[PDB]
Design a protein around this ligand. Structure first.
Ligand SMILES: NCCCCCC(=O)O
Ligand SMILES: NCCCCCC(=O)O
Ligand code: NA
Ligand code: NA
Lengths: 384, 384
């Protein structure tokens, strides 16, 4: 058992509706107004081809920028200096207002929601995960603190070989609906999390997407809100965003917090703007000044043993769902596979959003090229 | 085999991507920008409870209207007189700009797209279905004309007992993704259609949702466009709609033309406005004056043997995916289970949209109440 979860709608029974019951009362009143949450759906455009390149200023300092963006399978690119959009790029076929999957940049959004609840005193990072989700007792999450989940400093037996269906990575996707279910798979994401085990050691960084879903579960238990709603209430609805964001949901309606959010590049930049504004957004304060300060400060360097990150950023670290480069510019970034970045450049009070679709989830090759672009663009914003 | 179908994206292989391949190249470039088409997803609101009742004028002639709307599980109600919204109602929890499933009102939208292609000379209703979809040879659709599909005058062995999983109604839903698949089910909607049989007789009305999906298939074969795109290009994009509409799609990306469209009440009214404007919309002509005239004129009365319809509308009929009351007002309406109506009242140059969620798909009880409301509202618009 995974305990109480926020009902899909007011008064809904646990796990209702399902793909086989949404047309039945009393579920249909809700389902008829949110069918996309139950059945894959396509947009029928209200609007009746070519790449849009408006790199403005930085174009002079980076003459071959568009080509570099093409080489890194860039779909959407936007630079926000202060409150102004100073550079934009959208591939042919991708409109400026189209939404794009954020992959793990979604994690930084989840950490932000947790941060908001910490400010309210609803979540104490020093407390064990089980203080909020007792059902995780007996799992790898029995013992570690919420902060250790936030900083991903929990050793977990997590097979990362996607080529193997038995791997935890593939199983995580199947449990959430990102891939076709197989006989024996956990019923939902909550159940999947309870099956995770580890040797009990903590303190060393281990990137694991399951950690973020545990954070979302904690958010639900402390607020009583579906993660989908909590993400809106504590973050999205305060950004004065142009469009709603979307998030994939599993069979119980639980949002895939670790990587299922989609939004426009301009709106994602509003999240960065909030971080560079001490945690304040147009609709109100999202997180405390202290939380933002802690994110920019970075996590323990000693815990960061991922050579894939430290080879590029020797003094890098990770904290509260954000990757911290530890470079001379103090760059911090939300990162997602296939080339997604919500890059913060505090020195120039700028935010760089790059949403892409590399053929591979991750290779040193793509990261070298991607980071080269983000760093060059950041430097191009320096006063001269 | 079901023949050629519009690729999900430029250059996509048949049936790609699937739930298990969307993260792989070259599918991911498209999938990352349209994930809702692959995985159930929820909206994360950009906006931070009570029913909204603005029945305006008709309120005086129909004092208990709001109560009548509540009794018929009304979610959204809107009356457009000419180009003006003269009355509106939205239940608590349903925003004026929220979208609602249209169920079979979706059929009238599909018929409109077919009508547009008839005007272009791309579709000849007198031609057999097989002239456009040869793969339907050997099925109940081998012999009948496209017009007979439009008017639903084809006898089909179609078990309507949803309580039975083997029924065609339940099988249709499973083949399209509206319900959990079962071993042996057709792979997609196209395949399901090819399994349909009948005694060969035609001429008598038989309401069958499979007919509309055949129309959508014809649309795809004649235009080379996914039905989702054709619905936008030939109709939605010409309405100057406030929001995109959405349509559920099966595993191949084929839109559920017979009942999977969702849109706002105000936008649905724009479709009615176009019909009352001789087929012209703000973005251009959608269908010919003749097509609209034929819809308002009705189908053959003798073909209409559905007592459930004729008991209320003795001179009623059906043509080109629209129900024609044949009443003294010449009312015509798009109709969907659970209380959906796109009701046309030419006498007062008005359109009435009623989107609901009755607990039951259909009962004489609900229809009596629903039609009573639509008729009373129509009469309340008459000059006095
Ligand atoms: N298991 C689906 C991928 C989740 C995103 C992970 C990442 O972007 O690092
Ligand atoms: N098989 C799903 C229902 C399709 C809608 C049918 C109707 O509204 O009449
Ligand atoms: Na905080
Ligand atoms: Na026409």
């Amino acid at each position: 058992s995974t305990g109480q979860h926020p009902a899909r709608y007011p008064g809904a029974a646990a796990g209702e509706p399902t793909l086989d019951s949404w047309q039945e009362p009393p579920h249909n009143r809700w389902a008829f107004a949110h069918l996309g949450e139950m059945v894959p759906s396509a947009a029928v455009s209200r609007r009746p081809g070519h790449a849009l390149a408006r790199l403005g200023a930085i174009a002079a300092q980076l003459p071959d920028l568009e080509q570099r963006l093409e080489q890194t399978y860039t779909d959407a690119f936007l630079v926000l200096r202060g409150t102004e959009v100073v550079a934009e790029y959208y591939r042919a076929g991708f409109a400026p207002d189209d939404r794009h999957l954020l992959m793990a940049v979604s994690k930084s959004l989840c950490g932000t929601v947790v941060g908001a609840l910490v400010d309210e005193g609803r979540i104490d990072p020093a407390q064990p995960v089980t203080e909020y989700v007792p059902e995780l007792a007996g799992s790898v999450y029995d013992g570690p603190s919420v902060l250790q989940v936030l900083d991903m400093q929990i050793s977990i037996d997590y097979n990362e070989d996607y080529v193997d269906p038995a791997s935890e990575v593939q199983t995580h996707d199947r449990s959430a609906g990102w891939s076709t279910r197989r006989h024996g798979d956990p019923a939902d994401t909550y159940e999947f999390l309870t099956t995770l085990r580890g040797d009990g050691s903590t303190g060393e960084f281990q990137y694991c997407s399951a950690n973020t879903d545990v954070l979302a579960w904690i958010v639900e238990r402390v607020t009583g809100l579906r993660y989908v709603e909590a993400l809106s209430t504590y973050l999205w609805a305060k950004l004065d965003a142009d469009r709603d964001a979307t998030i994939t949901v599993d069979t119980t309606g639980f949002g895939f917090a670790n990587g299922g959010v989609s939004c426009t590049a301009r709106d994602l930049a509003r999240v960065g703007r909030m971080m560079l504004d001490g945690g304040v957004a147009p609709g109100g304060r999202v997180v405390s000044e202290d939380w933002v300060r802690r994110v920019l400060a970075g996590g323990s360097h000693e815990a960061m043993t991922d050579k894939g990150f430290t080879n590029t950023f020797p003094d890098g670290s990770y904290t509260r769902q954000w990757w911290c480069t530890g470079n001379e510019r103090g760059n911090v970034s939300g990162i997602g596979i296939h080339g997604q970045n919500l890059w913060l450049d505090p020195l120039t009070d700028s935010v760089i959003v790059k949403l892409s679709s590399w053929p591979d989830p991750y290779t040193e090759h793509w990261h070298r090229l991607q980071n080269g672009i983000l760093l060059d663009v950041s430097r191009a914003l320096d006063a001269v």
